[PDB]
Amino acid sequence: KRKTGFFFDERCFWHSTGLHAVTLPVGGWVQPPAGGGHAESPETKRRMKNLMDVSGLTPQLALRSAAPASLEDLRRIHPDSYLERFKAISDNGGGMLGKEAPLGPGSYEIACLSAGLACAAVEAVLKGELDNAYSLSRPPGHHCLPDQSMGFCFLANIPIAVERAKAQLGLGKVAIIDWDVHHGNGTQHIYLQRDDVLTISLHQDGCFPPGYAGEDDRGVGAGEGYNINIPLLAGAGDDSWRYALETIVIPALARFEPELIIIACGYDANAMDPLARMQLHSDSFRAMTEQVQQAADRLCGGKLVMVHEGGYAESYVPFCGLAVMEALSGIRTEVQDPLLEFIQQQQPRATFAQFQRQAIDRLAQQFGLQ
Amino acid sequence: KRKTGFFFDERCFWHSTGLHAVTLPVGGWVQPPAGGGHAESPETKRRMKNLMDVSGLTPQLALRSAAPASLEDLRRIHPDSYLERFKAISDNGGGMLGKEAPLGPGSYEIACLSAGLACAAVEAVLKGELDNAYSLSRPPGHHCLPDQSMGFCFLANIPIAVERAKAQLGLGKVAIIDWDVHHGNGTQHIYLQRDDVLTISLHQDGCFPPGYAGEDDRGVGAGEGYNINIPLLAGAGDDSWRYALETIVIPALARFEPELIIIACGYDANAMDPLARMQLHSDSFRAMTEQVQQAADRLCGGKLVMVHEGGYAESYVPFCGLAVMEALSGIRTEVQDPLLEFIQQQQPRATFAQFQRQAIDRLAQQFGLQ
Amino acid sequence: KRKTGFFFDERCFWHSTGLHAVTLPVGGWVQPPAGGGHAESPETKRRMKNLMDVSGLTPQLALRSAAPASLEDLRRIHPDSYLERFKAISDNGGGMLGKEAPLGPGSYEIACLSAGLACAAVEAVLKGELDNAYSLSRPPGHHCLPDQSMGFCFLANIPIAVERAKAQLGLGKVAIIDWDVHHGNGTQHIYLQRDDVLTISLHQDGCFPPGYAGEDDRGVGAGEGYNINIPLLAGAGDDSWRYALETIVIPALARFEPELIIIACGYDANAMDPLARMQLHSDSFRAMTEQVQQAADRLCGGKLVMVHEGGYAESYVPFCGLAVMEALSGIRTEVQDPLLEFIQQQQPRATFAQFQRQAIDRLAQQFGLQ
Amino acid sequence: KRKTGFFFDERCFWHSTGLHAVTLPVGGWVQPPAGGGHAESPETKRRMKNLMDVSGLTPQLALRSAAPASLEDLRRIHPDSYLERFKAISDNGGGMLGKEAPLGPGSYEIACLSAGLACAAVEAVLKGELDNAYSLSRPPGHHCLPDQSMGFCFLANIPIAVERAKAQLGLGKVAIIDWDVHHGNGTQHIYLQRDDVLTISLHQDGCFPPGYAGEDDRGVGAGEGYNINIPLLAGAGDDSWRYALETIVIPALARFEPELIIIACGYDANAMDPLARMQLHSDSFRAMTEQVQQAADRLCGGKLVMVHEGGYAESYVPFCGLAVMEALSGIRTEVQDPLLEFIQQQQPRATFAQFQRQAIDRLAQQFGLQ
Ligand SMILES: CC(/C=C/C(=O)NO)=C\[C@@H](C)C(=O)c1ccc(N(C)C)cc1
Ligand SMILES: CC(/C=C/C(=O)NO)=C\[C@@H](C)C(=O)c1ccc(N(C)C)cc1
Ligand SMILES: CC(/C=C/C(=O)NO)=C\[C@@H](C)C(=O)c1ccc(N(C)C)cc1
Ligand SMILES: CC(/C=C/C(=O)NO)=C\[C@@H](C)C(=O)c1ccc(N(C)C)cc1
Ligand SMILES: [K+]
Ligand SMILES: [K+]
Ligand SMILES: [K+]
Ligand SMILES: [K+]
Ligand SMILES: [K+]
Ligand SMILES: [K+]
Ligand SMILES: [K+]
Ligand SMILES: [K+]
Ligand SMILES: [Zn+2]
Ligand SMILES: [Zn+2]
Ligand SMILES: [Zn+2]
Ligand SMILES: [Zn+2]
Q1: Is the torsion defined by CA of A334, A339, A340, A342 positive or negative?
Q2: For the CA of B26, the nearest ligand
Q3: Residue C105 · residue A27 · CB < 8 Å
Q4: Per the database record, which ranges form the Histone deacetylase domain (chains A, B, C, D) (predicted)?
Q5: A257: how many CB neighbours lie within 10 A of its CB?
Q6: Does the N terminus or the C terminus of chain B have fewer Cβ atoms within 10 A?
Q7: B34 lies within 8 A of chain D by CB
């Protein structure tokens, strides 16, 4: 029993993105969906929170909202030309922020809140008010570039919070581990030339951005050696993800000695996700959380923040999220994941598993960790 | 330009299955979905048909319905105790046909129609009225056992049609190739001891039934050598599926010399499916159709029937289906798959590809085809 | 058994309108809907067609599509400034055609088709190819003004067809009876000064446009006496609507002696509609169709066209539509409306009924028909 | 600024009812809905709560849950044969509690909670812990009979709470005013022979139960004069409902002198509801709440509890609910109902209004209040 913060706000569930057929834009040869048409849907996030409430976990956590991120907070990462364009589109009823970047009315102010929840989570943990913290930040941040929206992300949530903590709370070295199944291209870009932040991304080889693996992208100038990409094979499951973490990430954290670990916590590597091809189950996410909590215990006095990114499986993500929040709080509810055993049976056999283990061995050797 | 039959009936879209959160049954810790709750949804199938209509393809096909399969047709595969129980549940408003087998009111008569469309497709092609044919059979059939519903399947559609054509149309040897991403366990069971039907299943290793691969299950007694399972690795994409077909399936058809090829045609290996982890795109399905049409040209005077099975990606399956129907008819519409290039970029790199190629080489050697 | 045309096209179901919470625009204090968000939804229209197919009625009808209405057809009603603006918005991905007028990508070409179905229905009946005809025209037309979209209507479907038949088929006098529950303000405006068309609207007093009754709006100049508005009381049911028709509309048709009767056929006076407060059931719509078919038998050699307008009750409109198509074709299927008896029991008691009868008496006296 | 209790629990939103097309059961000629299929949907209730949160009202209220109603609580109203049957169906995965009474897995325990929220609301107000209180009780109660489920109601929520307060808190006379648009037949039956409770129902003449008005049903034996039914005319709006309240209900409360007023608070008389034909807007519900709060100020030291019943308009009910909670708390947020002015314009003209006023005059004279 740690004191665990859960930062959320009902207004984050109000952001919308127009009419899509799953995640395809309607029009041309894409027929409008007969029902639901939300690209980045609030339902997964709300269902996680709803399950935390009925399981009895929520009253045992420290619940918080936050003030939105200020214009000054945003300007540590983003230029005003981008910000002004995003706000213009938001203020005028929603629309497109260049192609494939759909937002809705009031999305600007809801993105600032999202980023503000991450800012406050980082601060509460840094000041010792909380041992650790989870931010239910929607819309997500990890694909966002300084001057370009991408992958449903409009502001760089984690970098905004980190930059703000560097300027106002004397934060030093920080490691950002991104286990959303997609590549954290926005985080990578922002800290590419910087040695005061270690950015690690585990992701499906080639998934999004499409065709990017990135094992050879290590950082530039002072930043060289401070960016790690682990492109796992599509189809990998629990054994592979946990081995990448044991074999690459924990050793890399040990070498870098951070003052704070931040997880970019997506659940879209879960076995039922339509936006990737990985095979994780809720125990996978429980075990990964355990491993990074333990690292944090060893390295930075238990200081761990998690910020929600992706996950599109509407009925399965809540179990994965509850599992994380259970591991992070050290409280186990009575909930039993009704798919766990089914997904355990689907996991890749030893041939694939050994092959992926070998690929991860080669990566750790390439990064000087073996 | 072949004369291509498309067998469908509006009533097949009326079958329902109760309230699910995606495919999880509601209750316990599964919250009811805020919108749509259909496990096996008509929308994918209807959207395929809708796209065939607006693209201008439908008027170029021979459209047909059928009479439902008779009780006598069904009794060539299923015992009366199963049939009577299914009909009882259907007649009484729907319910459960043992656990994980949900059906709705009138589902019995709609399953008989579904099976009847497959019966008529097979017959029209066998009697030379059509060169080839597609049946939009819902509910699906390939998981159904003689006395047990499974995987959303209630009657064994393809075996019913095949048994009926053996009894009434002098049908001899027939090959059934199942490229739904899941294992065709129902077909396998029914023809396991039989040498007059070759059952081939390509499927994701371990997906459904969960934990089953099956490479060593080859047939029993007279049936030995007449069942082929190809458990591809989760994550495999276009290169792998087409290589399994070139390297195992076409050679196996050449050895067996059928009078008719039947595809159990699922689209749930498409890259956006929540019910498996494969990475096929619409050109994948186009190329696989081409390869089996060409085989049929070489072996049985072009006689090819395809029967719809699975596929859960609501916005993507229609493009995969249109692609098949375009390849089967030899008519190319103006439709361009808006995801094709994106999914091509996501395909596994050469390391994985060569590894899966090697695994398929070993399988073909084990089955005496190399 | 008449020869009855049913004009429809799958592409009309592809028009979309963005994200609404029922019919409220999302944003501000309107939370995005957790599921379906279609203001003017294709589902009601598709469900009607689906029910006509499974009941066995569809094969007994003459099914037709049409060529879209040409630019020249549209310019008999609409100026180019409006048309160009509508097309611009459509061509650029959808948007707003002034406030409360939402459309989607490609809506222009789908509106032209909709209007084209009405054009062709009118022509087939006028040339004696069909005895009568129904057009499943979506999007609807009756609220559209020459230069302004309103009430989900973008082109004036019926006026376009009528103007075209006047220019190319020597059409003379025509009566347009609008029993959509809302006021046919677009039709009224277009023919207000004209004595060659009688426009009658039955509508809920004050519903839409909001606050408009219109009993005193009779026509202007040559058009005076050629426009009839019957503002029925909210809450009125079967007895009232059928009495308005017996007492006002049929006598008005007798006085005017048309060559063609066109019904603007909405079903949003049905007892389950969220967009008005009337209490009609499927037998109501059956009886109203009978009365106008009989009038047409007496006045213009049975020449009757019906064009779909409104109706938002997703589960109930199909029964109302099937009823109309049954009455118009003279074919009764086996379908029994499962709500009919329930809605019959809800109908207003004699106090209200006599009061509304008296109000209609006064209207007919004001219009010189009693 | 009163101290206002809001009693709610996330688990009440988890109750489900199977697959319906709006509120029609699927099967036969009712096609399954392509999206959402919830007869009694949690979305209206959740959206009200969500709007209370984003408007800033929620933190100003006293938020509470409750213990479920005990078996002993339930047995003051319901016999064990009914209870055991309801629980059996709930425990076995859901089903039907006789015809048209659909429930889902775990619905029993969720109905007990619902009733428990009402019990606790009544108690907090009676013991002076709160000035007034609202219970977001789902599933609803007012149609439920002792031994029969009806109108989506499974336990008699308000009678259970009232009977419990009579047995444990020395509660005397209580008035129950039911302004859900449907008849409160369950409440009426339970207190029909009793003079210690005044049951008043305003409802749409004939709506549900279908064909029931009830002006002549006044009570039986000791209960005679203690039951008042006001069957308003379908179509009535703000003026009519508020006049029925001024002219019948407040005078009837003055005569009876209660210790507690309980509102059975449905919102299904709102102008956009598909389950009735009334024309109320959010200011209607605000004004009705004001009038009964003021009565309570005059008669029972401000003691007022409201228990949620019906309301099916998903986008409009939240505004009606927020309005009530604003009037009950005495706190006005910044929210402005985006439909208010539109619905004000739709209201029936003076002819209808005077006619309904006269009908209400006659009712008050029949009940000895004029
Ligand atoms: C962006 C994303 C996930 C983000 C997230 O979860 N961030 O981590 C996934 C892909 C499948 C997607 O939705 C998409 C849609 C349309 C399209 N084209 C029209 C070319 C290309 C891609
Ligand atoms: C059956 C199937 C696909 C069939 C098809 O497409 N046939 O080819 C897929 C799986 C994901 C599924 O839906 C499921 C649901 C619940 C569950 N448990 C409650 C244990 C276990 C599995
Ligand atoms: C237009 C229409 C029906 C048309 C049709 O059926 N034509 O006959 C109905 C009304 C209820 C409507 O949807 C609406 C929505 C929003 C709004 N404001 C935001 C002020 C005002 C009105
Ligand atoms: C029960 C109710 C509202 C309750 C509520 O809001 N309580 O106050 C409304 C009616 C419209 C309904 O849904 C219905 C459905 C089916 C049916 N038959 C199949 C005959 C008859 C009626
Ligand atoms: K870095
Ligand atoms: K990642
Ligand atoms: K075999
Ligand atoms: K297969
Ligand atoms: K006129
Ligand atoms: K009208
Ligand atoms: K009483
Ligand atoms: K009532
Ligand atoms: Zn992601
Ligand atoms: Zn499958
Ligand atoms: Zn209308
Ligand atoms: Zn009600």
Answers
A1: positive
A2: 2
A3: yes
A4: 38-326
A5: 12
A6: N
A7: yes
Cα–Cα distance for residue pair B101/B99, rounded to 1 Å: 6
Count CB atoms within 10 A of the CB of residue B26.
Answer: 22
Residue A207: half-sphere exposure toward Cβ, Cα within 13 Å = 32
Best CA proximity match to B9, nearest among B66, B56, B69, B50:
B66
Sketch out chain A's domains with CATH numbers. Answer: 4-9+39-366 (3.40.800.20)
Q: A15: nearest CA in chain C?
A: C32
Q: Measured between alpha carbons, how far is D230 from D245 in angstroms, rounded to an integer? A: 10
Using DSSP, state whether A36 is helix, strand or coil. Answer: coil
Please give the structure tokens belonging to residue A58. Answer: 């929520």
Task: Residue B263: name the closest of B195, B339, B331, B187 by CA.
Answer: B187
Q: Which helix (H) or strand (E) holds B115?
A: helix B107-126
Q: Which two tokens stand for residue A14?
A: 């109000």
CB atoms within 10 A of CB D88: 12
10 Å CB burial of residue C170 (0-12, 13-18, 19+) is exposed
Asked if residue D160 lies in contact with residue D153, where contact means CB atoms within 8 angstroms, the answer is: no
CA A6, CA A10: separation in Å to the nearest integer? 13
The stretches of chain A forming alpha helices (DSSP H) are 43-54, 71-75, 80-91, 107-126, 157-168, 185-190, 238-244, 250-256, 282-299, 317-329, 340-346, 350-366
Contacts of B20 in chain A (CB under 8 A): 315
Contact at 8 Å (CB) between D104 and D94? yes
Strands A102-103 and A95-96: antiparallel
Q: Order of strands across the sheet with B132-135?
A: B62-64, B4-7, B132-135, B304-308, B261-265, B174-178, B197-204, B227-232
Distance CA D86, CA D145 (A): 13
DSSP reduced 3-state for A268: coil
- For residue C108, give the nearest of C125, C129, C133, C89 by alpha carbon: C89
Q: How many A-C residue pairs are in contact by the CB < 8 A criterion?
A: 59
Distance CA C98, CA D15 (A): 42
Q: Which residues 6+ apart lie within 8 Å of A261 measured at CB?
A: A174, A175, A176, A177, A253, A292, A295, A296, A299, A300, A303, A304, A305
Ligand 15 mean position to C317 CA, how many Å?
A: 12
Classify the phi-psi angles of D3: left when phi > 0, otherwise alpha if psi is within -120 to 50, otherwise beta. beta
Q: Are B181 and B268 in contact (CB under 8 A)?
A: yes
- Whether residue D54 lies within 8 A of chain A, CB to CB, comes out as yes
What is the spatial distance between Cα C321 and Cα C57, in angstroms, rounded to a whole number? 12
Q: How was this structure determined?
A: X-ray
Hey, are the CB atoms on C104 and A43 less than 8 Å from each other? no
Q: Is A29 close to B346, i.e. CB distance below 8 A? A: no
Judge: D236–C235 Cβ closer than 8 Å, yes or no: yes
Q: How far separated are the first and last CA of chain D, in Å rounded?
A: 35
A309 lines ligand 1 (CB under 6 A): yes
C95-96 and C102-103 strand pairing: antiparallel
Tell me the resolution in Å.
2.2
3-state secondary structure of D312: coil
D345 DSSP 8-state letter: H
Gaps after residue numbers in chain B (C–N over 2.5 angstroms): none
The closest alpha carbon to B162, from B141, B183, B136, B185, belongs to B141
Q: Is B143 a catalytic residue?
A: yes
Q: Which of C20, C78, C143, C203 is catalytic?
A: C143
Mention every residue, 6+ apart, whose C-beta is less than 8 A from residue B216. Answer: none
Ligand 1 pocket, residue A102 CB under 6 Å: no
- Whether residue A180 is annotated as binding a ligand: the answer is yes
Whether chain B has a CB inside 8 Å of the CB on A170: the answer is no
Dihedral over Cα of D325, D330, D334, D337: its sign = positive
